[PDB]
Design a protein around this ligand. Sequence first.
Ligand code: BCL
Ligand SMILES: CC[C@H]1c2cc3[nH]c4c(c3C)C(=O)[C@H](C(=O)OC)c4c3nc(cc4[nH]c(cc(n2)[C@@H]1C)c(C(C)=O)c4C)[C@@H](C)[C@@H]3CCC(=O)OC/C=C(\C)CCC[C@H](C)CCC[C@H](C)CCCC(C)C
Ligand SMILES: CC[C@H]1c2cc3[nH]c4c(c3C)C(=O)[C@H](C(=O)OC)c4c3nc(cc4[nH]c(cc(n2)[C@@H]1C)c(C(C)=O)c4C)[C@@H](C)[C@@H]3CCC(=O)OC/C=C(\C)CCC[C@H](C)CCC[C@H](C)CCCC(C)C
Ligand SMILES: CC(C)=CCC/C(C)=C/CC/C(C)=C\CC/C(C)=C\CC/C(C)=C/CC/C(C)=C\CC/C(C)=C/CC/C(C)=C/CC1=C(C)C(=O)c2ccccc2C1=O
Ligand SMILES: COC(C)(C)C/C=C/C(C)=C/C=C/C(C)=C/C=C/C(C)=C/C=C\C=C(C)\C=C\C=C(C)\C=C\C=C(C)\C=C\CC(C)(C)OC
Ligand code: HEC
Ligand SMILES: CCCCCCCCCCCCO[C@@H]1O[C@H](CO)[C@@H](O[C@H]2O[C@H](CO)[C@@H](O)[C@H](O)[C@H]2O)[C@H](O)[C@H]1O
Lengths: 41, 313, 259, 318, 63, 277, 44, 65
Amino acid sequence: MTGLTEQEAQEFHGIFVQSMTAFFGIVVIAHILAWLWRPWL
Amino acid sequence: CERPPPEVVQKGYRGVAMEQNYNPRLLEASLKQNLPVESLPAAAPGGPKVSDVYQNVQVLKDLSVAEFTRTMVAVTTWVSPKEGCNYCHVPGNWASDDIYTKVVSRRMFEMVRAANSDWKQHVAVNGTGVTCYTCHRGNPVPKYVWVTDPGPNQPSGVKPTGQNYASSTVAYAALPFDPYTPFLDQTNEIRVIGQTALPAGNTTSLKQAEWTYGLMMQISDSLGVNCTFCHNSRAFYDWKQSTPQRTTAWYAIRHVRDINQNYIWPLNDVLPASRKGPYGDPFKVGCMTCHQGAYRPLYGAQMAKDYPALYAS
Amino acid sequence: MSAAITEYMDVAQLTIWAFWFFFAGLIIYLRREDKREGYPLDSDRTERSGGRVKVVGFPDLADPKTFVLPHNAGTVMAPRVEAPTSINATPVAPFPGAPFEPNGDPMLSGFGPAASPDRAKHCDLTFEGLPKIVPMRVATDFSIADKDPDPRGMTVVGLDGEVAGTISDIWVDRSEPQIRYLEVDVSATKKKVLLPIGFSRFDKKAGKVKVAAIKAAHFANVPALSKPDQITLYEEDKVCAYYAGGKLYATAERAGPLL
Amino acid sequence: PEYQNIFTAVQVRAPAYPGVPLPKGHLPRIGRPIFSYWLGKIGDAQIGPIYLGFTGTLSIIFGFIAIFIIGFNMLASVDWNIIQFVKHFFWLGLEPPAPQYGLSIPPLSEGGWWLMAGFFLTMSIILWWVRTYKRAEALGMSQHLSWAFAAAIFFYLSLGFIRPVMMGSWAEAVPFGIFPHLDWTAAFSIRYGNLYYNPFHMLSIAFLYGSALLFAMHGATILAVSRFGGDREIDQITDRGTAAERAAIFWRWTMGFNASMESIHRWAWWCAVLTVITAGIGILLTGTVVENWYLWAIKHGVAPAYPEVVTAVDPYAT
Amino acid sequence: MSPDLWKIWLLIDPRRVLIAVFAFLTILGLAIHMILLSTTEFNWLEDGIPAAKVQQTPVVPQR
Amino acid sequence: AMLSFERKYRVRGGTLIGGDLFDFWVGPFYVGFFGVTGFFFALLGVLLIVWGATIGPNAELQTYNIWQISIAPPDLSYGLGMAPLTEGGLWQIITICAIGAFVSWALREVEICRKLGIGFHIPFAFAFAIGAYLVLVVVRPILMGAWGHGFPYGILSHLDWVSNVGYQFLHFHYNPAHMLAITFFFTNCLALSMHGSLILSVTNPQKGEEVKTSEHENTFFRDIVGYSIGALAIHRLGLFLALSAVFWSAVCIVISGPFWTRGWPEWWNWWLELPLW
Amino acid sequence: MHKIWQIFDPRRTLVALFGFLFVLGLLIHFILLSSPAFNWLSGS
Amino acid sequence: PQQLYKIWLAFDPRMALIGLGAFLFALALFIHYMLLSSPGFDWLLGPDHAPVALSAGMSALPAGR
Ligand code: BCL
Ligand SMILES: CC[C@H]1c2cc3[nH]c4c(c3C)C(=O)[C@H](C(=O)OC)c4c3nc(cc4[nH]c(cc(n2)[C@@H]1C)c(C(C)=O)c4C)[C@@H](C)[C@@H]3CCC(=O)OC/C=C(\C)CCC[C@H](C)CCC[C@H](C)CCCC(C)C
Ligand SMILES: CC[C@H]1c2cc3[nH]c4c(c3C)C(=O)[C@H](C(=O)OC)c4c3nc(cc4[nH]c(cc(n2)[C@@H]1C)c(C(C)=O)c4C)[C@@H](C)[C@@H]3CCC(=O)OC/C=C(\C)CCC[C@H](C)CCC[C@H](C)CCCC(C)C
Ligand SMILES: CC(C)=CCC/C(C)=C/CC/C(C)=C\CC/C(C)=C\CC/C(C)=C/CC/C(C)=C\CC/C(C)=C/CC/C(C)=C/CC1=C(C)C(=O)c2ccccc2C1=O
Ligand SMILES: COC(C)(C)C/C=C/C(C)=C/C=C/C(C)=C/C=C/C(C)=C/C=C\C=C(C)\C=C\C=C(C)\C=C\C=C(C)\C=C\CC(C)(C)OC
Ligand code: HEC
Ligand SMILES: CCCCCCCCCCCCO[C@@H]1O[C@H](CO)[C@@H](O[C@H]2O[C@H](CO)[C@@H](O)[C@H](O)[C@H]2O)[C@H](O)[C@H]1O
């Protein structure tokens, strides 16, 4: 439908998963620090 | 920008839309700025009299020594807590009058006792009362005084208009920004609307309605309300369709005029030059000096009933 | 000279009453102007009365107004008579106010959304007397704006996304530079048909023209021109009406209802 | 989905059009036309030329003098501080003379500049009206536009000149400012007792709402039938096609009656003009024959009555 | 990140991202500097530090 | 009944709901299923308005004067619940009937334009006015917290409601969305006057003259103001201005109270407190 | 799982996600600044 | 349900995922906003929310009929 080959989807998915995992790790660390500063619950 | 919902108080008939809206967060923050002070314990009743142990007592002549010293201790907290008692009394003794603060406070005592006995149709509807802490709030100089405003600078040959300039005294509108002088100090007519359907000798100009509008903006800013707190906007002139708070405001205007003309101006000789405006008049009292953004001072906290030295009898 | 005429009347009341009188007059005038096209009405009351009672309502009609057309095209009366016609349909039910059924083949029926009057058989003219809507093969001084697709050679697809031809020429307007028509070279009869812009969607990404009115097999019945360089007011109306009929007659599911 | 004809998908460029030739004794048009691509997605992509005669030059001179005076006074009101001028720009204004002068000429700082600015602005507006009349007549057209502009000018002069002269003072006139003239609008209503109860104010508001309704209906109608060539309204007026017939039939089926392609443009013309006519009367009756509109409405049985649930004691009636 | 991240530019052109980032960081810096200038705790010009050496007449206490 | 050229267009089909059950004409009107529903919603609403006038606010202030008839919403102490019939529930029933009638009218227009084969601009434009009414009586009362925030149904009383709501913010002219909406309204009136004037001038020339062409229309406004927008673009612009006015008025009324509870001039303090000046 | 991008175009979803994340971050920071409990500039 | 896979034979999945994602995001925003309005579940007020007590005969809101 989108006119992409199979590998054009495989590589995109792999790099997307890696980047999203790293980005989520960053925000997890940031939220842990924020909770150690001033709890909000 | 704010987020809903507000707290709403309905004042009129349903469908007429005479209501007050408050933001709960802003209301809590404003409440945090107007707390009262816990009163001193009652004095032991009886013993030596004031007129037999003191010489230069003139206002508080009819008290007991215990009540007298309790009143002094309280007014130390209400006005000058940082400086203590040397702020008003010259060191060395207590009967001397060689300082202006003692004279000013002696006049202020009479002003407070007059407020608590002669203007009960304003300050005693619910028994709130007036104390020294109502204005000073712990400061030697009140935070909300006014003087005759000169306005922005003008060229030498230009005649000022007193308007067309953003100002917080009229809540950031382009209305005349000095409504204090013609109304709260002098005695000018506030009414501009005629009371007949057809013309009969009412030659009020359109520029006087703007002065009235500026005074009303200042009043509603001082009390933290809107117009429909006292009016029905389809007839501003009609007392039959207004609210009971309009009568209280009517009396409050005269009370403030009395305070300014008979208690503040005669003190202009003895006050230092740091308490005067560019025209040479002292700091004067307005609606903001007591209410400070609330419909009642301190939201109606009652601390005047515990001190019998603040009543004429 | 005062503001009180009597104990009750004043000036501001007489003024409002005068305004009401003027407003009533103005409304009568406007409603009389509204009735220059389509009156007297065609109803059962007229035909039962044997063409004796004429239904015009209130107010009645105005005296005829003359328009003079430029370049000696003639003269037209705003209220005029027109010949009653025999429609190509048949009533569904005999009670008054009933709908009609488009007898025959609905696309080729001339009834309903696929209907049109018979306009004058002459081309619209410019300020100098030239034909107004002409193909770009004779308006050579025209051009396509920069950074724009230039829809020549684009494939046209039908309602169901099936190709029905390609664009061959673009018909523009000399007086106001804009596109009024596209020319499609149908690859089923070796013919060329016109397509109004209002019935075509430009898919500029993949370079396509979408026609959601009629299907791909319907491009073989579009009314044709008399001469390949100009069009008349009659033929333009016929061409537009044929495509408009497809908005109801194209498929079996377009007559309704949803439930 | 379907093409709604809101934007132009593909544009076509032809050489510039100078315009219909003018008769003898006219100046040539100034400027060379140019084309704008983004402007062509919503309308015609050609700007210029323009015609500028003698009336058009005089209007420009008068109007620029008036605007320069207004701006100079706004700058003087902040003591030549340009930064403070930018800060307070919406609140600044030039204001009429004081009520203690009547219809006399006060000093410059006390209302002379206002009088001069008003005179020059009025002169420029009149000259522009003459320009519109002359340009309408040069091409052989009629004069509907100049009549509508005359109605607008009538309301403008009632607002600024006629009523102050009738009242006998310049202090009744409106200032030159953004927030100042809104303040004037509010104070006018407050002083004369709730202008909501002025019946000509009611008629004017009705006609303004009606103008908005009529323009929405006409625009949507013409855009809906533009697939049949309905935007070419002149041809439909002189030779009725399917666009005009369908547009009439839609509204006849919807609300029982309809207009014509020619006639609807009359409904448009009268609805807008009556907005300002009834406006000009409405303020000429205020302060001259009616003192309080709420009491006038009570006298004529218009104001509603409510149950007495809140009331106040009158301190002037004790 | 992944070694094969450099393929990102096969989807986004350098010009339209360089312009956006350069026009974005400037706006963010201006906004942050203004926000800090608005507060009384982080205003470096009117903080009174170091000293005043500027004398600061009757006043209008209404404003 | 029928115009002299209308019989060609009365075709069967194009309905949304109903099919052949309600597919007929009543005089000049087309009814359909939504015609029935809308007509009877309107009839019940009218009858309940008349009964509310008959009862009156009391037995002493009841009157049949058309300027003074008013049906009022409930008290703010009922919240979002259902009020007794005599104390404000009649207003709620009439509001429901009005909403039903408006939606039925819009759907009947959709059916008519499906039948005629034309675009859907007209019901789409009507939906804006319907949405403004819904913001007035549904969205704002829910955000505020009670049905009592709606306006009363009366010719002169809803003016009192508008005035008091306006003065609850001490100066309503300083509302910015209000300024935008007013600018759009005035511009729309100007544009309508010019469009009507130009069409009439071209169609009705000087005496002894022929009808003017399309070039004259463009030349006139290029010689007055130096630009001409075109025949189709003037209708585009008219629709755009008329809808923008209503959209910004709805925005202006929905932010007064729910999103701002102070005076409107004070809102401008963000401009006056910038560090530039 | 690795078949979403046959249905959804990647080039537009990258820029959409990038814009959405920044809008959400700005919104959350403004909301936190508007609350006296969590303000980090004047609370201390 | 046993043969629910036929539901994708009538509705296009490409539009269905867009609609579902948009609807779910809108629902989440609405529910969060509703909680933020409520006086019981408002975490922005902080864990240590202590409203001001009234020591004397004072009232935060004026009286109304
Ligand atoms: C003191 C009061 C304040 C003020 C307070 C308010 C308040 C409060 C409001 C406005 C609103 C408006 N104000 Mg204001 N406003 C003031 C001064 C002005 C001035 C001026 C010259 O000073 C102007 C030009 C305006 C203009 C405006 C508009 C922007 C707006 C009204 C149009 C609208 O909402 O359309 C909306 C159109 C509709 C709702 C039409 C709905 C009709 C539908 C289709 C139903 C069908 C009708 C009917 C049933 C059909 C059958 C009828 C017959 C049987 C045929 N205001 C003063 C300063 N203003 C209003 C607004 O913005 O609302 C959104 C509003 O609520
Ligand atoms: C039917 C009533 C409505 C209406 C009608 C109406 N208005 C009209 C007309 C009509 C029929 C015209 O024919 C006339 C016109 O020309 O229209 C194109 C006009 C007009 N309506 C206008 C405005 C206007 N109309 C308004 C309202 C209305 N007009 C009503 C709603 C309003 C409002 C609501 O406030 C305004 C502001 C003008 C644009 C125009 C008439 C212009 C005119 O007469 O100008 C004369 C004066 C000058 C040209 C002075 C210029 C001097 C210098 C050029 C100044 C130099 C400095 C410059 C400003 C600096 C900034 C840069 C510049 C490059 C911009
Ligand atoms: C949004 C842009 C503008 C606009 C557009 C617009 N209006 C439209 C349309 C469009 C495109 C139509 O197609 C439609 C129509 O049919 O026009 C002829 C219509 C219409 N706009 C109308 C009115 C109208 N539009 C207004 C405004 C506007 N309409 C905007 C300015 C106003 C204003 C400003 O007040 C009014 C009064 C109608 C003439 C018509 C819609 C008719 C309709 O819906 O009929 C069905 C309903 C009934 C016949 C009876 C309803 C029964 C109720 C119980 C009535 C009372 C309800 C009310 C809540 C109580 C009383 C209120 C008090 C204040 C009196
Ligand atoms: C005695 C008795 C019976 C008492 C009963 C009284 C009662 C209860 C009445 C209530 C009835 C109720 C509630 C509902 C009935 C509804 C019915 C059946 C009819 C009502 C119809 C109705 C609402 C009409 C309102 C129309 C009104 C007032 C204004 C519309 C705006 C207006 C001024 C239009 C005039 C101009 C026209 C016709 C514009 C349409 C029009 C436009 C806009 C074009 O662009 C166009 C382009 C090219 C060709 C033609 C046209 C064209 O005709
Ligand atoms: C760079 O730019 C410079 C500095 C050169 C100039 C810039 C100027 C600027 C920024 C100007 C800004 C102007 C603004 C914001 C103006 C706002 C104007 C508004 C809103 C005006 C609105 C209404 C005003 C009205 C209606 C006034 C009408 C007055 C009239 C009709 C008065 C007529 C008076 C007459 C005819 C008096 C005659 C008496 C005599 C002839 C004796 O007077 C001399
Ligand atoms: C309660 C009985 C008291 C006491 C002990 C004082 N005041 Fe007031 N006061 C008010 C205003 C407007 C002024 C002028 C502004 C100023 O001079 O600072 C004063 C002034 C004084 C002073 C002099 C302080 C000084 O500057 O040296 C003193 C010693 C003093 N007050 C004592 C206003 C009010 C009130 C408002 C109406 C009320 C109530 C009081 N004061 C009450 C008291
Ligand atoms: C559009 C239809 C109009 C029909 C009527 C046409 C005639 C209109 C004449 C009235 C014009 C206004 O006329 C003006 O009214 C006011 C108010 O009463 C008068 O004012 C006078 O009478 C009033 C009322 O007793 C008193 O204050 C005093 O005697 C005097 O001021 C003016 O002396 C007169 O000039």
